[PDB]
Amino acid sequence: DEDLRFCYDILQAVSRSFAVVIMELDEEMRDAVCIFYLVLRALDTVEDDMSIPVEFKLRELPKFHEHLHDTTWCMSGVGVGRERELLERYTHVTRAYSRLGKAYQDVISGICERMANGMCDFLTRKVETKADYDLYCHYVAGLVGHGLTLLYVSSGLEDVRLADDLTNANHMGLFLQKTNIIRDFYEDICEVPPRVFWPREIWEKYTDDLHAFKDELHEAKAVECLNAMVADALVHVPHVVEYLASLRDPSVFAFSAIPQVMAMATLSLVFNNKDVFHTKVKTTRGATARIFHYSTELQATLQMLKTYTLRLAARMNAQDACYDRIEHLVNDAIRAMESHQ
Amino acid sequence: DEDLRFCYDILQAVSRSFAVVIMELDEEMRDAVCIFYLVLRALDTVEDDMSIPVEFKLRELPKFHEHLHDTTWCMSGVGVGRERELLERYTHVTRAYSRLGKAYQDVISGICERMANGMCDFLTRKVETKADYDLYCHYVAGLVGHGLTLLYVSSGLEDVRLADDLTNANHMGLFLQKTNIIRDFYEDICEVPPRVFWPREIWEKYTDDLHAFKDELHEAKAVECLNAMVADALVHVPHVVEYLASLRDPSVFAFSAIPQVMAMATLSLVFNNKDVFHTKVKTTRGATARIFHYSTELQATLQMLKTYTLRLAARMNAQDACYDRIEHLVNDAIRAMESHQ
Amino acid sequence: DEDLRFCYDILQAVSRSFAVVIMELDEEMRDAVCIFYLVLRALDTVEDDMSIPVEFKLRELPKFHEHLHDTTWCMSGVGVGRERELLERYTHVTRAYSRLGKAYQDVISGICERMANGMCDFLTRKVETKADYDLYCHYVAGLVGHGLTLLYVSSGLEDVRLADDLTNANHMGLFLQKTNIIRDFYEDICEVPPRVFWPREIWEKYTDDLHAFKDELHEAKAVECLNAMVADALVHVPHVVEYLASLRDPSVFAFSAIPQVMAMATLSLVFNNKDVFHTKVKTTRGATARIFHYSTELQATLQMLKTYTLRLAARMNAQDACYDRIEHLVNDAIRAMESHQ
Amino acid sequence: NDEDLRFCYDILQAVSRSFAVVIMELDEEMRDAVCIFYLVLRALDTVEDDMSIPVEFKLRELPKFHEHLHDTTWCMSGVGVGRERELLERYTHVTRAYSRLGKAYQDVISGICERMANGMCDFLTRKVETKADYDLYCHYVAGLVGHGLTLLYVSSGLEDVRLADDLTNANHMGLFLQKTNIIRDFYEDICEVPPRVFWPREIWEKYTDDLHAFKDELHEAKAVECLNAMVADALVHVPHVVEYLASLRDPSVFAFSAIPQVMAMATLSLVFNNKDVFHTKVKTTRGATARIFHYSTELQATLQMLKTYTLRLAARMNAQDACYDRIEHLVNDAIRAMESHQ
Ligand SMILES: CO[C@H]1CN(c2ccc(C#C[C@@]3(O)CN4CCC3CC4)c(Cc3ccccc3)n2)C[C@H]1O
Ligand SMILES: CO[C@H]1CN(c2ccc(C#C[C@@]3(O)CN4CCC3CC4)c(Cc3ccccc3)n2)C[C@H]1O
Ligand SMILES: CO[C@H]1CN(c2ccc(C#C[C@@]3(O)CN4CCC3CC4)c(Cc3ccccc3)n2)C[C@H]1O
């Protein structure tokens, strides 16, 4: 049990936010999800550490999941801060893991492997196309959507029908991953070395050098490209609405809804906002408190997504080179919401 | 987007402290309040410029709210520092206003006009009586309490019932105002021409010349007069408590509460303190940081109000001439706080 | 095998209650009642869609029933919510419709056309007289009573002579629709475009304008008017009892009684209650669970109707203006009940 | 020539019998501006007043009614009856003439129109409950016209630019007219379908619980007592009317400005404490209005007439009347402002 207690502790240290959201789940499902997160997080720490060789990563990642059955395994020289501690003490995670249902372990083990191999794929190449963008998001986020959806069904909390078509589940992870990639542009490009995720297929029609977006000189093209990125993430909203409307359990719903509403709030804030290029744009502590509070049931959630979707569209005017493109994407999003009201 | 953005930069420039508090709000609520602030600050700038003929103000102020529906109106040789740019480029403010919802525009127009006329009353007469004091404070502060309240409701974030009886919203405005007037005595009286806000009805009981309190040879009376001003100020705390306890939205609550707790902490410092007469008593950067951080919810806000109230009390003597009044005003305050604990 | 599933899926989505009540019935009668509900629900969507031209509705409505055999038809831009998905996919309806006994088929078509042509009549005028009222209610609800009644006969579950005189069957419908109309005043009045159903005749004698009842200043006459609305509704009770007492099949009786008892309970709730003018007044969860549980046989059903009817009366003194008309009406209903006990 | 301008004057004479005469007597230059200004507002009013249209339409169309002033093709197809409807149909002539006016005249007209449109919207979706609502409603439909006309006097050069410094008295001019009509038109209004009410609850709720009660003779004591309160409220603007009139310098502007005020005082003195107000339309004799048009061309004569009408009004009440003290005071205040300019 002490191990399980370490997991929650490391969890809170590594991700304050998700560690509050996870508390919406019932203990059993919560334990499995917490461990699921720490597993992928440790995985993310290896892929991310740019101080270690690529061959080391392509050597360790593919078989990271196998370690789930080695209560003695742990890695010592990788990552920074808490993350680093997660790997050095990965023992607590794996053993906490072994006390999980067999159905949970399998989902976790499988998602971990598929994500790991997907990470290896993008370690030896960059994100050039939209197809690449969507696949990369699938590997790091979309699969977590799949994973969670399978854990929901396995817990019995949700119907078996949920996992029939894991498409909307993939959309769920994509909306969140994309909103973060859009929002963290500056911070990411300021890393050493730079971290780039925006697809060349998209940014290539606004600039020849992404780093140009950091300069006010090219502020018009930066915002124009920011706006195309938002347009690309909006594609997923209708599917996020469908998925959320199919959930029957209150806990699974709150845990699944909150992040999506936070993402829609953020996205509506980064849309057509030049500040995105020099700072981290975020919702107020007041607005996130309100979102966590009301995202416990469908109707309320749909109206908050509605509200934020309406605030997003209200930040533009005919003159913008996206107005038309964004406008129809907003109506699709709104229709789907009203499609359940 | 340049219109609203000018609003925020000027806001930050003209009032940095309140600029931080307004950032507790979000979306359209914040914009409305930002514009509301700028409209009244411009109004106040014109009203305060003593180089402007009283005759001009008497007719121009009452129609100031009318410039709101005229995106070409601006003023050019008025204001101190950044206040000048506000009047000169007022065009941005009115344009941003023209985009708020009709309900927000109305609260803003209405309050501005009512404050303008109230100022006009006091441009042709001094503050002699306590009734005058309360009425003057209602004109420049209480009404802001009224407006903000109407805006909270108009937004939907607080119940439509909050606006039934604006008596307490007025107390909110009067408590902040009186605390400032008390705290800025020295600075206000030490300029050409002297600004007197303390009602004769209170200070005549302690001297023939208010400008004499500066002298360290009339401190005993100055201090006794100060305590009298503090007592008068304390009358409003129970109502502030009541008003705060009726707020449901977290953003609106932080926004509304922070200035109040700051006010109470400042009141506990100037109370029975001679320094007020030769300098500007301010809180520590730590207390300020503390107040801004925890005033996000009722219980914690009340604990701080109680604490500052008790420290205000523990600073007096059974020997001091106000012991009796203050003690009652203090017990009235706490009784009301516990009333919501 | 797949078309009905859509009908049911959409039925539950479109109307949670009647979906539950609809399940009391035995499959044969069930599928028919389900398709019958949808057909009228789609019809109603087009009728109330304040988007489409009043000039256009009249043109089609009469056609609507004909579309029943046009298993390729579908309207794709009408209404909102799950209603839209219903119309755009009306195909599953029509085809599921061609598998029901030719007998069932005709009632649906016959009733639909009559209801359709009834909506057209009112799509041009207003509800002024109590006669306008009964007639309108006859088109939307009354005919449904006929339909369902003619379906009970066809099924062979009820005596073939149950449909000879349909006056009571029409009373079953008006009682439901009228009670709904009374309870939904606010919800209907606060619509854009506004929705009024209360007969000019009844409220001409109480206020000057109908929207006027929203104001708390007029609870006095808003309620008095409400009571006259209830008093009107109560006229149908005796005939609702008469009708339920004639049913012999357990299933038909349950499906037939539950809605009626629910209506009575709501009626006893809205009577002399100003909350009707600013909120949806409704039976508590416990009360409706009991209604569904006990309304399976005449005697228990009569006891529940009596109880509610007696609470309806217990909410007025010799003080009230409708007291006399009410006391009488309550009596007529109770006699009817006692007449079958 | 300018066939467009002739259309404006023919229609003006068809729609407003009252103001057409005073507008027509104006010095040619500013007259067209005033004519076109009246038409625009009357058009706006027609729309707003047609109850056979959805509030949602007006709330959606009135706020932009001023933008058509710059569109020579805009005209409205089917709203309002009589000559009023014909105006909106061929509104193209009004907008056509508007374009040949001085830019300053155009600006004044647009600004007031828009401010009025939006004010009608306000009271389109709510009621006049308080005396504040009353003054405000009168401000949107009449006071603002006083604002504009004043603005038009300055822009015309006929009056001093100083005239427009403080527009408070101008607003008083509008309210005195509008309030007198609302008082005199009580019955006509309340008999409308749907009924029309402008009398503020804050005043009538004190004499009845249902405004329709005054319709019948059984509540005649309270009706009249309420009518008298309304008149009192109206009398509040007279001192200000006097001040505005005494401040005009051009004879043409003065006659055009004064005649309607004198007609209002005359009508007020006749509806006051007069119970016929609740069953018919009380009005001055044609000879009285002819006498008023003839004499109200210079300050002294106007004051004198205003004075006699005010004294005629005060003589209609008795000590036993409730309003005695209130009226007697307002009367004495009006008469005093008149005496200060003599
Ligand atoms: C089906 O609805 C769900 C969709 N959700 C998702 C989707 C994707 C992710 C993720 C992720 C990461 O990219 C971020 N971080 C942790 C796991 C990976 C790699 C580094 C996350 C975060 C996460 C939560 C729980 C376990 C692991 C990861 N959540 C939460 C619900 O809205
Ligand atoms: C309901 O609780 C509220 C009470 N609050 C108040 C009350 C009064 C004022 C003010 C003010 C001023 O006197 C200062 N300054 C700017 C507006 C006037 C004239 C010159 C202000 C400042 C202000 C804030 C936002 C918009 C306008 C003014 N805030 C903020 C909350 O605690
Ligand atoms: C013989 O007694 C019956 C009386 N019942 C009624 C009477 C009327 C209606 C209805 C209706 C509607 O006006 C409401 N809504 C759905 C159908 C029409 C048009 C839009 C409805 C709803 C309905 C239920 C089943 C099939 C169709 C309609 N039920 C159910 C039993 O108590």
Ligand SMILES: CO[C@H]1CN(c2ccc(C#C[C@@]3(O)CN4CCC3CC4)c(Cc3ccccc3)n2)C[C@H]1O
């Ligand atoms: C400066 O003093 C002036 C005050 N006067 C006023 C004041 C108000 C009005 C008016 C008006 C209306 O309410 C009547 N009608 C036409 C314009 C509005 C809306 C529907 C009118 C009518 C009118 C006359 C000429 C042009 C426009 C409006 N006149 C004339 C002078 O005594």
